[PDB]
Each structure stands twice: as structure tokens, then as C-alpha cells.
Amino acid sequence: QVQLVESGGGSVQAGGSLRLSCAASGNIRNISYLGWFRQAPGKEREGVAALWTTQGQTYYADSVKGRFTVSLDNAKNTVYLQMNSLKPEDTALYYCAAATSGQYNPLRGYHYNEYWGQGTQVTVS
Amino acid sequence: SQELFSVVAFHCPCSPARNYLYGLAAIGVPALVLFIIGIILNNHTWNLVAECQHRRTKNCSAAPTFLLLSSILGRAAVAPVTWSVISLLRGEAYVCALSEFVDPSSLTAREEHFPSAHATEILARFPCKENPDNLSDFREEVSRRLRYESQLFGWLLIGVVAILVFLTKCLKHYCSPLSYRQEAYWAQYRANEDQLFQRTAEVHSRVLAANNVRRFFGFVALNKDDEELIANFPVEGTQPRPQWNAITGVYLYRENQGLPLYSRLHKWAQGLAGDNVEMALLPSALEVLF
Amino acid sequence: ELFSVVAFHCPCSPARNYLYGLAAIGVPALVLFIIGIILNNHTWNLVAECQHRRTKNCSAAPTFLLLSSILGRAAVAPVTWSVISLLRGEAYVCALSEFVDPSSLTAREEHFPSAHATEILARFPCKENPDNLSDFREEVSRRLRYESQLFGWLLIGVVAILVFLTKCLKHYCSPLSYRQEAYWAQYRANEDQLFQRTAEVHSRVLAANNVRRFFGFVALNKDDEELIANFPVEGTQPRPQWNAITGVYLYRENQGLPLYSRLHKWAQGLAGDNVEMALLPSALEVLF
Amino acid sequence: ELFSVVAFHCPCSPARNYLYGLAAIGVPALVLFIIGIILNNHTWNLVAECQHRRTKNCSAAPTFLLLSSILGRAAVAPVTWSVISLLRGEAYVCALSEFVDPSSLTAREEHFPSAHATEILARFPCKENPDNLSDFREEVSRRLRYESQLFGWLLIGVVAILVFLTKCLKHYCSPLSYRQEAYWAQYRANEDQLFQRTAEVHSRVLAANNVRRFFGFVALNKDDEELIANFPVEGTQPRPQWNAITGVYLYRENQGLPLYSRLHKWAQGLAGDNVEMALLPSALEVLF
Amino acid sequence: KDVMIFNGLVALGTVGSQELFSVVAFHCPCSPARNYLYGLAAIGVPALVLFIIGIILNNHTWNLVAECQHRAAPTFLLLSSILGRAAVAPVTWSVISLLRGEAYVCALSEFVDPSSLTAREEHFPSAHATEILARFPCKENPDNLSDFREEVSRRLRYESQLFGWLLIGVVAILVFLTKCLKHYCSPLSYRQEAYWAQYRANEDQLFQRTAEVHSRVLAANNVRRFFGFVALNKDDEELIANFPVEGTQPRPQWNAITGVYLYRENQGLPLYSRLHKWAQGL
Ligand SMILES: CCCCCCCCCCCC(=O)OC[C@H](COP(=O)(O)OCC[N+](C)(C)C)OC(=O)CCCCCCCCCCC
Ligand SMILES: CCCCCCCCCCCC(=O)OC[C@H](COP(=O)(O)OCC[N+](C)(C)C)OC(=O)CCCCCCCCCCC
Ligand SMILES: CCCCCCCCCCCC(=O)OC[C@H](COP(=O)(O)OCC[N+](C)(C)C)OC(=O)CCCCCCCCCCC
């Protein structure tokens, strides 16, 4: 029902400036979760940043505070970010995800909705 | 078990309007229990419930459902019938239950010496011998008339069942679109699948359990054969819940590309059975960050 | 104690003990007759033959012989039971006790009462008789037990002649020779033995493949591992291939060489658009 | 043996026998109910769950199903004892003997004395009754023993329906198919057998090292030396690590892959300053 | 497990002794103020002896005494363990005696109220009221009093068995409550406690086996030192050949591995015993 469109991948040296656009199409009316995740071969996936639409506060990872900033286009219903001071550690597949603030009935457990979008970003040096 | 057999022994309460309630309970309860046991142990009733679980919308019509209950109740009713027959052939349960309804005026083998003041009371006490000796002949006259009817119904019940089985197995083969030889091969497949699947489930659980125990202590104590299972049959993960949900339920011979499919597991393995996250341990990965 | 349950118990009552004798003997014979038909495999292919045709295409000439084989083979168990129940004599003295004529009684002076002749006579099998009539009782018992055993022995005599006459006509009227029908019988008993054996192996290998697709491995016994290695399966035989081997077959020959079963007839290729009972609709309908 | 000591003996005294019947039946039903609770490990991890939370954090719904399973798996023993004690009839004829109304008694003319009705009625189970009243002794005994057995069969029938209704409701309301729960059950049994068996081996290997550190050597049998050689221990598991696998668990699913136990939940890494009950104080405080 | 093997034998043996005791040595001294003491001494005294005996054979009590001589939660376990293994013997003897009913009617026959009987008018002399009643259990009374004797000999028999079942009900509740308190008030989970109990049994099995072996090797070495040669079998000659002589443990070290355990852990890793505490400590 919700499809995420992402673009902005490239190969830039250290210190390059890059911007990743996550375009959300569908029923985003019940979405309360907006952010980005990265994963590289040989290790698991971590989240650089995340934003709450409803509460309004925002999250950044330890290597992201002061290095990458994520912005939301409320009118366009899309997610934008800024990549600064590129490093070889940033060569990973970048994805943007969403969720619906899943409830919790103690008998069954947490249940919610999740979405993903496939993207790439590698820094040569 | 000499002591436990005397527990279920039939003790007729020689009292009027009272000995058939006991006869109904002493015979109808074991017949009901054997009926329930037949339902519980039958796997064909749990995938019928499992069919009503995930569909949740009355998707199955009367045609497939009525052909499933008939199989469940037909296989279950074997035990109550073979108990309701033995009780009738013994004759104890019927002479006790019907001893009070014997007509005193219809008695024979003697002159009309039968008392008429308390007639139901004396008649009901015949099965317990507690009768005056002047009515001993009348006691045995009743004891044979009622035992005859008990065995007359016992043989008619066998005869009626032996006809329903013949009619059922004759109509099952006539109405089925498959030949009787393919249904014999199908029955051999369902027996082999339901045996191998259980055998692998035990192994795939023990190997999975061995990995978890190893992750705790650092080693697992395994028998001579158990150590072979770990090396021969390594596991890497657990099958997802929707994958399990795609092999449980009823199935009525769907055929693909001119090639038969004989089970839901077979139908799933061909790939013909294969967003919203349910009952998760923790909230979304985005919520984990906060 | 199943035998003690089915033990004969004569209800000594007029017009009542032959209903029991009929039921206690006719129902076990009926059950053995039904079991004989059910277990026989020559009746299910007869049903299968009447199933695919749906129009009674086959004539009565071949149908009569198949039904005769089914009934004749199934009727052995009722006869060998109805003979035993007659040679014992218990089931017949009980049934015919009331019909003994008191006027024809002997071995005693004519003291037999006429007040209730049927009622006194009907109680003879249960030994509940006055000692002044015990001479008649043992006279009636020997008379009615003889008729039971006489009928029992004549039934064996009739059966032993029908069996002889059936076999002689089976050989005189059959176009084959008795040394070939013996070879044919040794083949049908070998095709069935092998076909049922390979069906279990083919099912198990097919069942193992599906389980392996689920768990990633199959827990096989020491000998079951030989079946998978020696006998690999690649698919399931189509439904028309199974229909081509089920039915009644009566010795057709092809180019001078005999064919002994419709599996053999199918193997030579002498048996083998519209899609039925499909999982999913036509591939064109799937797209939409 | 024990049956001689625990043999039922009815005290024929009014308003006193049913108290004995309550004690001779209700106490073994209580003891078998207690034993079922103690042996059931599901009642201890429920306690362990309450032990760590200390704030009643869990709702009634997880506890209600957990508490129900403990009682249901333990109430079987009292029922199979209450049923037998009711079908025997001894414990009920003794209890209800004095409540029998002499007015409704039959099978004998009205000779029942009215001077001491309850006293005489209560003496029926012990056969301490006058012979003029002996016709009522068997009349009263059969009436009460019938109600004892009638209640026994109804108890079996009701239990045999509650078991059916429980199992039917368990499958219908469960979030898993009956086959996955079958696999889940085959996992927990395999985990418990393996976990306890390594816990015995781990202790023996750990104990041997402690013995070796003391005497300089350990006296092992042929098989124990294999245990030390095959399985070398490097340390001990922390208490919080142990506490991560104790308690109740209700099928939490991670990333679409099922988890079947807290140990499985811990093995995946989804379960794992302030120091309690330490042997020695803070390292700085040790210096002082 | 092994606990049921030991408890089952003790429970069965006490019943067998009680049955043997009742058929060969039990006679009510039918007379006032004598049978009551005799009946009381036929239950409490045999139970008290078993209670003291059960304590003495337990190894943990003497360990507790030594610790107290050298001196909560550690004391809870032992008292729940020693009594669970020593109070079995008195309780089974106590319940069978009450369920049998011989001892109680042997005791309270003196205090039976003559006017409380039924089925006839009260027939007892003013002076010999207790004397006649006290002679009921011996069955030596004249048959003229058998009507009254049966009521008394069955009333007290009812009271005996009623107390026998209520004692079982009380004990069964207490065992359940002890189990709950042991698990609920314990600082460690029951999975670790089961592991802890397994370790203690395994340590004592190996410690006893090693100590006997070490003593034989140490004794053999002294024989070699004193005589210059040893006459040992193949196994004994191997044992010294595989087990070098460690020497004499210091006096504090033996005192370091004796006493009670409080389950003190050293920086995360638990220690389950004093020997494990000593081995890990140094
Ligand atoms: C302990 C046993 C001792 C032996 C005695 C019993 C014989 C057992 C073997 C033959 C039976 C059998 O095989 O029963 C099986 C069939 C079931 O046929 P279906 O309903 O189409 O089920 C689907 C077909 N399947 C099961 C092959 C897939 O039953 C029947 O058709 C009738 C069962 C008889 C009991 C009900 C009779 C009616 C109630 C009483 C009315 C007055
Ligand atoms: C426990 C068992 C005891 C062992 C001995 C029993 C006998 C065995 C051999 C005989 C059976 C046999 O050979 O049956 C075969 C024929 C069937 O005739 P068809 O159609 O040509 O069959 C061809 C032969 N087949 C089946 C091998 C292909 O039967 C009969 O014609 C007579 C059967 C006898 C009983 C029925 C007689 C009529 C009913 C009674 C009338 C009052
Ligand atoms: C030696 C024994 C011989 C056989 C005699 C008994 C056979 C029973 C076999 C099945 C047992 C079983 O496991 O029962 C299962 C259920 C438990 O229900 P739950 O709490 O939802 O458990 C969920 C399912 N589990 C067990 C897989 C986790 O039981 C019951 O619902 C109750 C058992 C009946 C006895 C108590 C009834 C109420 C008291 C009386 C009220 C008038």
C-alpha cells in the first residue's frame, strides 16, 4: 500500500556532499516513523537517523550527529538528508523505512507495519 | 487389573423408574467418552479447526465441510458402536433398564399368580434375584424375554452397521473422480509424509535445541547416535510462521499442469502455496532507536 | 471373552426363538458376506468400470462373469458358517422347537398335554421341562438335531458339487488352456505384489523430497537412505495414466502375443485440451 | 501393605460418618492436587516471573492461561481418584446413610422403628442392623450405591467434555497452527533433556577441577575421564545470564523468525555499576 | 530421582516395622491411667527416636555445628533439607499409627463418657465406670457388654483415623508452603539452584573418591619411606605412578573448605561451594 522511492546514490571521495531523497507514496496518513538505515557486506544493519512525525523529536547515531542531518518535506511527504565528511566507513547500502507505532497486547506481542526502500551509497575514498 | 475391573462393574439398582437412568449412564457415558477420544486423537478434526482459524470468513462451503465431518464422525463412531454392541449382546444393561416395563398380564409359564398391588416394584427387582420363590419361574421368564430383545437389537445393530459400511465404501469409490488405485497410492503418500515429517521435526528440534544449549555452556552432552545427528543434519534457522501456516489445513486433490498434488506440503514445495508484522518481540527498528 | 459374548442363548418362547435363531445366524453370515465383498479387489474395478463409462456401455455378457466371481468367492464365508451353525444343531432345535407336532411324538405313552402345546414345546431347548415329560424332550431334541445335521451335510454335498461343476465349466468354456491360466494367475499375483511394493517406495521418496524442501533435510533410517539413493523420483504420474490401469480386463491379444493385464496393455502403448480439477485457472486468467 | 492401613472403615455413627468420608476422600484428593502442583515445573517459573518483577507488571491475561495450565495438568489426579472413590460406592453409602428418609423406603412393609430412625439408618454400612430390618439394609444400600455410581459416570462425562472443549478452544484461539505447536512441543522437550544433561556434565567437570586444585589429582572412572577430556570448562555462567532463561515465555517472534524458548531468545542475543551479594566490598574499599 | 529412592525405602520400612511392631509387641494395659500413657508412648516415643536418628545420620547438621562453633538464607536450605530427609521417618510412623487406630483407642478409652453412648440406656456403675471402659480394647469384657463395646471401639477408631488424615493434610500443605518459600525467597533462580544442587552432589562424589585414593597413595608412600619397598597390586601401583604426592594441606586450608556457604560470587562468576571459593580464590 505504501511504496518508498529513493535516489541520490553516488561515488564521491572524502569530504564530499551528498543528499539522499526518500519519496513516500501511498497511505502515509498512519505513518509515525521516518528515518534511514545502512548495511554493508559482512555486518548487520544499523540506523543512522530517525524522525517522529507525531511526537516531533528526532534521532541520530553516534557517527551521525554533526555529520549527517535528515530533513522532512512535510508538504511533499518525502525524506531528505545531507551527507558531509564522507569516510570509507560510509560504503554501505542505505535504506529508508517507516512504521505505524505498533500497539502491544500482552498476550500476542507487538504488531505494526513496516516498509523499506532499496538504495546504495559507496565512497571511493 | 482385578481391582480396577470391579470399579466399572455393572451393579443394577433394583428400583422402579431408577434402573434405566443408571443403565443409560453406565452405557451412554462410556460410549460418549469413546466418542470424544475418537475425535481428539483424529488429526483430521484439528486441521478442520485450523481451516476455520485462518480463513475466519466462512470460505469453505457446505460441499467440502460436510465431506470432512462425515470422515471425522465416521471414524469416531467405530468405538462407541463396538461398545454399544457388546453391552447389548451381554444383556445385563437391557434387562436392568427394561425390567420394570414388562407387562404383568402378559406373563406366562405359570397361572396368574403375579401380584397386582405392587407390580412395578417387584418387577424392577428381578435382575437382583431379590424375588419371592413363588415367582421364581416368572423371574426367569422375564429374564429370557428381555435378554432376547437385548441380543436381538445387538445383532440388528451389527447388521445395520455392516450395511452402512458397505454402502459408504461403495459410494465413496463410485462418486470419487479418482480411480481406487490412485486413492490407494494417495493414502500411501499421506502415511509416508505424516511419518517422515514427524521424524524430521524431532531431529530438527533436537539439533536446534543442541545449538541453544551449546551457546549457553559451550558444549553439549550427546549420545553416540545424537552426535551423528548434529553433524549429519545441521540446522541454520527456524521456519517462519506463515510457512508453517501454508501446510496446515484441509486439502481436496488440487491438480496442477496435469500432475497431481497430494498434500499441502507437496503443494507448498512446488511453490504454489507461497509488510504487516504480527506478534513481534520488540517494536520496529525505528522505535528501538528511541 | 468375545466367544462368550456371541454364545448362543435360545429364548424359549413361542414365535420368538426363530426370530433370534434367524438373527443370531443370519447376521453373522451377512457380515461375513459383506466383508468378503469389501476385501475383494475384483469389485472395486467393477465399480470403477461403471464409474468412467457413466452410460452402461459394457454388455451383460462380461458383467455377469465378473459378478459371479465376486459373489461366488464372497459366499464361501457365509456357507462355511451356515454349515457349522447347522452341524452343531443348537441354532435349529431352538428355531423349530414350537413346530413339533405332539400327535407325532413317541417313545412314551400319549400323556403329552394339549392345554398349551406350543408353550411347553418351545421351552424344550432350555432344559426347563417337567420330569414327567423328559422322555418327550430328549426325543424331540434328537429329532430336531438330526434335521439340523441332515441339512448341514446336504449343504456340503450341494456346495461340493457346485464347486466341481463351476471349475469344470470354467475350463471347458474358457478359450485358454489350464497351463496358461496358471501362468496368467502367477503373473497377476506378481504384478500386484510388485506394484503395491513400488507404490510404497515411490510414495516414500516423493514424501521425502517434500519434507527436504521444508526442513532442509530428512531424517531417514539406515534402509530408507538406500531407497532415496537407488530410486530417485522426478514427478507424479498423471491422472489419465492411473485411469488407464484400473478396471476389468479380459485377455485381449495384440499381433498374436497375449496381454495379461491392463498395466501390461498400457505399457505396450495400447491405452494412451480440457483441464479438470485444476488448482488455479488457466494461465491467462492468472495474469488478471 | 499400605492398602490394609488406608483401608476405608465406615464409622456407623450419625452426623459423624460423612465427616470421615470427607476426610478419607477429600484429603487424598488434596494431596494428589498438591503433588501435581509441585512436580509441574510450570508453577515455579511462574513464581520466578513474580520474583524478579516485584511490581505486578504482567497483566491477568498472560497469568490466566499460565495458571489454568498448572491446575488443569494437576487436577487430573484428584479426578481419577474422586471418580474411583465414587464408583466404588463405599465412601458415599457411608456418608449419606443417615439422610435416607424412612418414609420413602419400600421393598418391605412399614416395620421401620421411629424411636431411633437416624441411629439405625447410620448403622446400615456396618451390618449392625436387626434381622427384622435386613430387607431395608439391602434396599438402602442399593439406592445409595446407585447414586454414588451415577455421580461417578456424570463426573467422567463432564470431565470428558471439559477436556474436549478445552482442547478445541486451545487450538481455535491459538495464533499458531496445530503443527507448529506440535513442533514447538517437540523442541521444549528436547531442550529440557539436553539442558539438564549438560548441567550435570558441566558440574562434574567443574567439580573435578576443584578437586584437582585441592588434592593435585582426581580419581575418575573410565567414562568420567572422557567427560573431562571431551568437555573442558573455561568458567562459570553469571547469575544474570541464568536469570535470562528462567520465567514464562509466550512465543515472541523476531524478524519473522520464531523463537521457541527463553534460552532460544537468549541464544539469539535478544535477552542480554550495581553489584549485589558480592563476596567482597568495592575494590577501593578492600584496600581500606 | 535419587531422593525418591531413599525416601521411598524409609517410608516403606517404617510402615513395615509399624506393622511388625503391632502384631508381635503391642498389648493395651487395660486399666485407668496406665493405657493412656502406654498409648501415648506407642506413638510419640517411636517418632522421637526416628527424629533424633534422622538428624544424626545427616551429614549437613554436623557441618552446621562446626560452623556455629567457629562462629539466614543458607540456614533456610539446610533446615528445609535435613527435615525433609529426617522428619520423614517420624511422620510416616505417626500417620500409620493413627490410621491403624490401635494406639489411639488404647489411649483414650479411659476418658470415654459413659453417658454419651447410644442404642440403649446408660449402663455403667458409678465407681467402676472407667474400669469397665478401660477394659474395652483388650476384648476381655463379657459378651453382655459387646453391644456397648462396639460403639466405643469404633468411635475412637474414627477419631484416630480422622486425626491421621488431618495430619497428612497439614503436612502436605506445609511441604507446599516450604517449596514456595524456598523458591520465592531465594536470591538465585531455580534453574541455577538445580544446577547448584547437582554441583554439590558431584563435588562430594569426587571428593570422597579422591580422598580415599589420596589416603591409600599417601599411606603407600609412607610404607616405601619406612621399608624401602611396597607390595601393591597393578591398580595401586598405577595410582601412585599417576598421582604425585601433593603433601600435607595447611591447617587453615582445611578450615577454609569447611563450614556453611552463603553463595558469595567473585566479580560476576559465581562460586557454588567453599572448595570452589578456595580454588578460585587462590
Ligand atoms: C475396534 C474395531 C473393531 C471392529 C469393528 C468395527 C469395524 C471397523 C472397520 C470398518 C469400519 C470403518 O473402517 O469405518 C470407516 C468408515 C468411514 O467412512 P466415511 O464416513 O466415508 O469416512 C471417510 C472414509 N475414510 C475413513 C476411509 C477416509 O465408517 C463408516 O463408513 C461407518 C462407521 C460405522 C459406525 C457408524 C454407524 C452408524 C451409527 C449407528 C446407526 C444405528
Ligand atoms: C475357510 C474356508 C474353508 C476352505 C474350503 C472352502 C472352499 C474353497 C473352494 C471353493 C470356493 C471356490 O473355488 O470358489 C470359486 C467359485 C466361483 O465361481 P467363478 O465365478 O467361476 O469363480 C472362478 C474362480 N476364481 C474365483 C478363482 C476366479 O465358487 C463357486 O462357484 C462355488 C463357491 C461355493 C460356495 C457358493 C455355492 C452357492 C451358494 C450356496 C447355495 C445353497
Ligand atoms: C492416569 C490418568 C488416566 C486418564 C484420566 C484423565 C485423562 C485426561 C487426559 C488429558 C489431560 C490434560 O492434559 O488435560 C489438558 C487440559 C488443560 O487445560 P488448560 O489449562 O487450557 O491447558 C492447556 C493445554 N495444555 C495442557 C497442553 C497446556 O485439561 C483440562 O482442561 C482439565 C482436565 C480435566 C480434569 C479437571 C476438570 C475440572 C475439575 C472437575 C470439575 C467438575
Residue numbers in the entry:
A (entry chain O): 1 to 125
B (entry chain E): 35 to 308, 314 to 329
C (entry chain F), D (entry chain D): 37 to 308, 314 to 329
E (entry chain C): 19 to 89, 96 to 306
Article excerpt on this structure:
The calcium homeostasis modulators (CALHM) constitute one family of large pore channels that contains six members in humans. Although sharing the same number of membrane-spanning segments, their arrangement is unique and differs from other large pore channels, with an extended helix located on the C-terminus and forming the core of a cytoplasmic domain further mediating subunit interactions. Here, we investigated whether these placental paralogs would form heteromers and characterized heteromeric complexes consisting of CALHM2 and CALHM4 subunits using specific binders as fiducial markers.
Although our 3D classification has defined a broad distribution of different heteromeric assemblies of CALHM2/4 channels, the population in each distinct assembly is too small to reach high-resolution. We have thus pooled the classes of all undecameric channels containing two to four copies of CALHM4, and proceeded with further map refinement, which has allowed us to obtain maps extending to global resolutions of 3.8 Å and 3.3 Å for the datasets of samples containing either SbC4 only (CALHM2/4/SbC4), or both SbC2 and SbC4 (CALHM2/4/SbC2/SbC4), respectively. Similarly, the seven following positions (3-9), occupied by CALHM2, are well defined, whereas the two positions adjacent to the two CALHM4 subunits in a clockwise direction (11 and 10), which contain CALHM2 or 4 at different ratios are of somewhat lower resolution due to the averaging of two different subunits. This feature is particularly pronounced in the dataset of CALHM2/4/SbC2/SbC4, containing both sybodies, where position 11 bears closer resemblance to CALHM4, as further evidenced by weak residual density of SbC4. In the CALHM2/4/SbC2/SbC4 complex, most of the positions occupied by CALHM2 (i.e. positions 4–8) are also distinguished by the strong density of SbC2 binding to its intracellular epitope. However, since the C-terminus of the neighboring CALHM2 (CT+1) contributes to binding, we find weaker density in position 9. In contrast, the weaker density of SbC2 in position 3, which is fully occupied by CALHM2, is probably a consequence of the distinct conformation of this particular subunit, which compromises sybody binding. In contrast, CALHM2 in position 3 shows a distinct conformation, where TM1 has rearranged to maximize its contacts with TM3, resembling the ‘down’ conformation of adjacent CALHM4 subunits.
